[PDB]
Amino acid sequence: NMVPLNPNRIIPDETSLFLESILLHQIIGADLSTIEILNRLKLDYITEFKFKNFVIAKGAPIGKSIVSLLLRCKKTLTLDRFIDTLLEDIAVLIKEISVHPNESKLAVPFLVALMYQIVQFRPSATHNLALKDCFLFICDLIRIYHHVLKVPIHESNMNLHVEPQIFQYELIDYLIISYSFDLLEGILRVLQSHPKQTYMEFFDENILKSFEFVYKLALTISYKPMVNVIFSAVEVVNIITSIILNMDNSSDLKSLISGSWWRDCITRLYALLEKEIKSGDVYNENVDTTTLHMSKYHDFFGLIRNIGDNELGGLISKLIYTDRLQSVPRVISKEDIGFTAPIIGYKMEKWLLKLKDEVLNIFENLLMIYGDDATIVNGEMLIHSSKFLSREQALMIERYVGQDSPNLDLRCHLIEHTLTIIYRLWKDHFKQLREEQIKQVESQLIMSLWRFLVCQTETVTANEREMRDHRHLVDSLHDLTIKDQASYYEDAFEDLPEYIEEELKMQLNKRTGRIMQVKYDEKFQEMARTILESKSFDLTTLEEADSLYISMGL
Amino acid sequence: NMVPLNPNRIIPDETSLFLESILLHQIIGADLSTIEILNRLKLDYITEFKFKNFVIAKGAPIGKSIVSLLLRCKKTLTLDRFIDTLLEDIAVLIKEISVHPNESKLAVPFLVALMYQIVQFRPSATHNLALKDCFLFICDLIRIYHHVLKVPIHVEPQIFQYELIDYLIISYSFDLLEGILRVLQSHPKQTYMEFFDENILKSFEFVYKLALTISYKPMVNVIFSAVEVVNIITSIILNMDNSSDLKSLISGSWWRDCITRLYALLEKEIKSGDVYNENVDTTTLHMSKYHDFFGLIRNIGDNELGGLISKLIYTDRLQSVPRVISKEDIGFTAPIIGYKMEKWLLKLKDEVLNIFENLLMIYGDDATIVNGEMLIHSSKFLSREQALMIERYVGQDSPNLDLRCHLIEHTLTIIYRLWKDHFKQLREEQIKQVESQLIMSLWRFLVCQTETVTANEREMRDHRHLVDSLHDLTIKDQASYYEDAFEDLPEYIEEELKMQLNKRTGRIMQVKYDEKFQEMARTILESKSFDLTTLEEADSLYISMGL
């Protein structure tokens, strides 16, 4: 039963694999490895930089120097040390060509991207000090680029959108921001999977405050934000909360994070959830931020996620001359970027949908961070939460079913889950909710519960006769998915073994029922019922709960 | 007691450290990661390139595709297959730029430098098939550059057009042949024969015929490269136990057609005072303003063009054509470079007579290559350099005195083994044609038998203070820097130092030679394998020391 030592192992040098995954590293749509995009850039307003042998001479491609750095500190460090050292060095570079307001700072985006490829090449050994370094670092960089993150909601008269149609530097700023927010996500991840015996370090008031300023610059309630940064900021909020739970000695750091500071998170995050999605004009200047757009004028994927078309990634395939040592880079253009494939809008909206899954689940995570709570959840996480829950009931009904699009099932699963969030709030966090706010939203609460309730008996099919017709009229997308998973996307789900389609006929059927407002899992239905029929609090008037229920029975 | 273990044995991969060396490739003076060097090589004319996935276009740098390969080729290929893939792909590059006379070839020099980091990376790892092919592809590139194949001996007036391009790549490519065959040498003594292909040896015979250019001024970096290639062949010969097979492949015509130009080499002069001077050619080893630098192993001395190798790639601009490497913007403070060049060409002459004495060893029996013409020229070398040393290289206070001593003593070994056993080639033609050289090679070590020269400690120390001052300052550099127990000595180490130095400078003086060497020039006369001197002539030399 020996498992033999292989006396001639060939075990990789992961720092070497890293050196590779750097020198080859290419952003989505680029002509070059983005490292080489660096490697064709000399800049004339930094004659000579050094931090620790990183001379970007007066005649150096910022690449030339950065790749050379990869080589030097490759010879120097071991893996964790090299992660830390590229962090520090590439950062202090990002500063010295970011706080230098007259030079071509297009190294900076891919430098941040390099932060990303670093931290998320070896999030195993990356460590708190340089984590916070790059974190706070590009945070202050985003405070450097106050202009784009805070551009007037509609350019009020005086302010004009007469911009040089320039995703050129628009890319520079936006790219840095989103890439670095994804780097914040990955830093949270190194600590997020890091042992929770050691969670008192990468949390500090400086993390919080830098994020204050940058979060507020991105979720610009007064100006016209962009959806990559909105995604990214709310994702950072999300992982922040994830660790607010996954920190064991939680009371101390929950004291450290200010209650008013989560509050200033969630004012803007409720603001988000109440901002909406106008696909037909998502690639056009729409209404005052109540229309998440990610306009083609500022449009690429992002790093742990690909929401746009990344059309402007193609113009990164014209980002530099690719035949010239450019001093300032090749245009990317806001006008050129963006009847062709509204699947573009559909996948991006499937994101924004998953975004609001993130939002609901991290609102939910807040719900857990406090069992006994404070100003962030003061019945407001019933007000705004159930307001979203009922807004999505009303939208799914009034349009989205029949609108019968890719969104349907994902949205219905996640808003029934936000129903469940309402449920556990109204049961365990039932302690907080006081009269003033249960009166501000008695409406939403009671009738959202009532809507889900008018279903359980379901005398229609209770089977797969023509509720499968419904599975075709709306769940046709998930029918394409059952086809695709059985024919393309499962090693075993070809030649079904006859104990699974017996289940399919009803399971996918109640999936499309949850799409079409009915036949939610008995779990779901009694969740919704018990939220309302909890007579322990007179949410319902006992003499009229009969008039309520008699829409179904009871 | 027991040897201990390790929880996390963290071995960098062989290819990991490979990319280390490769990416940070650098050549003395080429100040860069030579991969980056390559990154500064765009080629407009050729907008179409692809061997094993080698995309290249107008403003698309050779190096951009070099990094491309290096990187994904690490995860694709293994150690030696990585080597081979680089060899063949970057060799297709070598070619299609070489056969592309319209473009300039700044690629091939550092491409070949990359080829060397490859080649050197390991002997055992590197595989002889790949090594085989690399040399063949270099020969194809030389055929593509037929116009600039050799250095034809006044359009050339301080203008480094193709001199810093094709000719620079020629020195690089020649140093590549050299190190290629050196890693072949290092390959174990069992598995040469696949390398031994008359394709290989004929192509080399041609490139040697182009390097030791007797009729056109032969660039000395190239001369060194070629003679070292010959040394490598003769060494792989001494090594392949089944040497009969390799010797069957190497034609007697190959032997002759090479060793004859090696004679024409060993009898070109070594003259420091004019080494870096293009004056009397076919004698003085020029390599002056025209062209001097390292190549791929050579530490030619200053490496004057070294920093210019970096100055070949802009390292500040994308260049389609080479950044000017100035030909005589070059260096010059004091001829310690000429002194080390004397020592360098003296190690070249050493390599020549070394493979000579080495073929005299293996071909101990009758040999069409142990013809005694060997006797003639090699004994000429012996007596000639003996004369030069005792007549001019005395008082000269050089380190090169030691190396001329090496020359004479080693050619003594050669002609002596010729004397002792291998007269089966010899006839009276060579006997009387060179009897003076042999017999006086004999007496020069005979007369040393006095042993009353030193006999003491007050005189040879001063003799070295006189002439050996150089190697004395070097034994002091030794006592100070280059060894370990030069402190609180056991009273034998310093004594050995002084005996060795004293006998050493004596050996510079052609007196008090190693008594083994005294006998190993006595026995040729006194042992009657050949009675050079009759009884009416032997005493005529016996008188010159007493006897």
UniProtKB/Swiss-Prot annotation, chain B:
GO MF term set: damaged DNA binding
Record flagged with keyword Manganese: no
Keyword Nucleus carried by entry: yes
Protein origin, superkingdom: Eukaryota
GO biological process entries: chromatin organization; DNA damage checkpoint signaling; DNA repair; establishment of protein localization; nucleobase-containing compound metabolic process; regulation of double-strand break repair; telomere maintenance via telomerase
Principal location class: cytoplasm
Post-translational modifications: Phosphorylated by MEC1 in a cell cycle dependent manner and in response to DNA damage.
UniProt keyword annotations, A-Z: Chromatin regulator, Coiled coil, Cytoplasm, DNA damage, DNA repair, Nucleus, Phosphoprotein
Gene Ontology annotations for the cellular component aspect, listed alphabetically: ATR-ATRIP complex; cytoplasm; nuclear chromosome; nucleus
Subcellular location: Cytoplasm; Nucleus
Misc. comment: Present with 606 molecules/cell in log phase SD medium.
Biological function: Forms a complex with the serine/threonine kinase MEC1 which activates checkpoint signaling upon genotoxic stresses. The MEC1-LCD1 complex is recruited by the single-strand-binding protein complex RPA to DNA lesions in order to initiate the DNA repair by homologous recombination, after the MRX-complex and TEL1 are displaced. Required for the recruitment of MEC1 to DNA lesions, the activation of CHK1 and RAD53 kinases and phosphorylation of RAD9 in response to DNA damage. Required for cell growth and meiotic recombination.
Subunit and interaction comment: Forms a complex with MEC1.
Protein name (Swiss-Prot/TrEMBL): DNA damage checkpoint protein LCD1
Organism expressing this protein natively: Saccharomyces cerevisiae (strain ATCC 204508 / S288c)
Part of the intact protein present: 189 to 747 of 747
